[PDB]
């Protein structure tokens, strides 16, 4: 398997929407690689449209927990929680290819039923938007107010624009 080969060289591929399955796999791989060598850095290649917020945070929390530094490479598209994960890479080691696309926006969800239940859902997603925005702010250098404003609607960015924004640190060329 081509991917299993990449794993042998400490490279994890996040190339599908993020759901609990994908999340659990990535997390396991991260813990595995960290176990084999807590020194050698790990590379997380990203080409994902995003997905579950709790799934992404599982990945994020694991990236932070392990000792090895996790570098992130945006290949193709890094949208929503995928973009979040890209920004979460080890400061100084967050890359993107020349024509990569990075999109940041606010969480998506739903609420059905009684006003009380809709309110429960509302508070949760609003709380999540804040928790995410705060991390984005820290990771980019942008003030929170700026992150809140810029993520109000789908915000597509070129690699050059992602760099200027503080989402990535370098654009891979040749």
């Amino acid at each position: 398997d081509i991917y299993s080969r990449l794993l042998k060289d400490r490279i994890i591929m996040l190339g599908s929407a993020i759901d609990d399955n994908v999340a659990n796999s990535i997390v396991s791989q991260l813990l595995f690689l960290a176990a084999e060598d807590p020194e050698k850095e790990i590379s997380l290649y990203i080409n994902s449209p995003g997905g579950s917020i709790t799934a992404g945070m599982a990945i994020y929390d694991t990236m932070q927990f392990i000792k090895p530094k996790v570098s992130t490479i945006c290949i193709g598209m890094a949208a929503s929680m995928g973009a979040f994960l890209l920004a979460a890479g080890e400061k100084g080691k967050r890359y993107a290819l020349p024509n990569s696309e990075v999109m940041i926006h606010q969480p998506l969800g739903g609420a059905q039923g009684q006003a009380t239940e809709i309110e429960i859902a509302a508070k949760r997603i609003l709380l999540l938007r804040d928790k995410l925005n705060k991390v984005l702010a820290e990771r980019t250098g942008q003030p929170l107010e700026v992150i809140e404003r810029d993520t109000d609607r789908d915000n597509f960015k070129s690699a050059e624009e992602a760099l200027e924004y503080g989402l990535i640190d370098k654009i891979l060329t040749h």
């Binding site: 060289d9 400490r10 490279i11 590379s43 290649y45 570098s71 490479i73 290949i75 080691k93 890359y95 891979l172």
Partner: peptide, 6 residues
């Protein structure tokens, strides 16, 4: 995707 990741 080296130089430099690996």
């Amino acid at each position: 995707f080296s130089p430099x990741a690996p």
